[PDB]
Amino acid sequence: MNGTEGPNFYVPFSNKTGVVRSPFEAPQYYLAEPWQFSMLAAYMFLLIMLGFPINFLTLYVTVQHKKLRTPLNYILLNLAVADLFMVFGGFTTTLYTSLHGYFVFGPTGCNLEGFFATLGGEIALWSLVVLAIERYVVVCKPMSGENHAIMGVAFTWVMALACAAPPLVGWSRYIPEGMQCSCGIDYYTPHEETNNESFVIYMFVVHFIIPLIVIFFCYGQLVFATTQKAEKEVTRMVIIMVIAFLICWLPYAGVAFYIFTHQGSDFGPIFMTIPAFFAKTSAVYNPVIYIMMNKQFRNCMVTTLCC
């Protein structure tokens, strides 16, 4: 009796004491200190706070300019889209759930949080698969624009929904993680009824390993003036965009696997929730690069701002 499994949920805390209650019913203040739930809402507020403006300006500026039709801008608009789906779809639920200290919205309330957290990561991942492929085709120059880019950005949504939808199908499921504020794939219970054991494989296989292959496959191709300045900074930004993505998603991915391996073991609520909430910076960091590094954007952003 390390953790407490229920129909909907799994609380990483022993109900030897008798205290454990469903996070779809009562607040989970026996898990952690009540101020830490406030700290989550504080953190989670600022993700939504600097989430919308940075993404919305980046969304607006890209479309407003009839310029800025480079494959990079299509992807970094695609992200500005999904980052706003994260903010309004996911972060809202978890910021509100942080307040109450439990998924007050209900089982479907959990699905929201987990779904757009899943889209956000996958559309961020499969976009870096596209950025990997695209900088190989120009730099190494194997096959000698606009239509190409829009097809490959439609790819990211195709594959992200291959990952995010099935929990909602009923293969796997979204389940409250750690402090019972975030939601994510069921790494905890076998739930063979749900068959979620098999999904975790499928996800770490098709939606992690296959991407990271193709990323470093293309990165390994590039081991052996001004066109190439534009090339350099934007091909450098592809690198920094992945650097950030690895910083972001590794910790949670690690802990997610660690629990999948050691199902039923002794681990605290904060073990998982920290890297989970950390990985929700995916909404904000992506455009910050696109302004910081891409100078061509930064100019045009100020154009839109300073009319």
Partner: protein
């Protein structure tokens, strides 16, 4: 399609003994843990005992600490509860739950009236 039998149990001696059973059907049994949970005639469910999927570490409530004892057969898909040196308050309907939860999946239970 899940099916948990709730065999073993009945009317017993004050300070008697009795062995319970729980034949599991319709899932990967050894992939799952299993518990025992009883329904006192009056008050809410007590989590009696529990055991890991491999069967390594059994855990008991202080109520039935060392008097009761839990063990499972992965091969046969069965969970047992050897109850010894019983009492009147051990009188309850015993259910065997899966996972770690006092969430009771369908069974007859077993009215062990002491």
């Amino acid at each position: 399609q899940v099916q948990l039998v709730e065999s073993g149990g009945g009317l017993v001696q004050p300070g008697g003994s009795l062995r319970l059973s729980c034949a599991a059907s319709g899932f990967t049994f050894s992939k799952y843990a299993m518990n025992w949970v009883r329904q006192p005639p009056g008050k809410g469910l007590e989590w009696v005992s529990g055991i890991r999927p491999s069967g390594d570490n059994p855990t008991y409530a202080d109520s039935v600490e060392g008097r009761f004892t839990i063990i499972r057969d992965n091969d046969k898909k069965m969970v047992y509860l050897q109850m010894t040196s019983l009492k009147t308050e051990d009188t309850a309907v015993y259910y065997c739950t899966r996972g770690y939860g006092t969430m009771t999946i369908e069974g007859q239970g077993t009215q062990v009236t002491v």
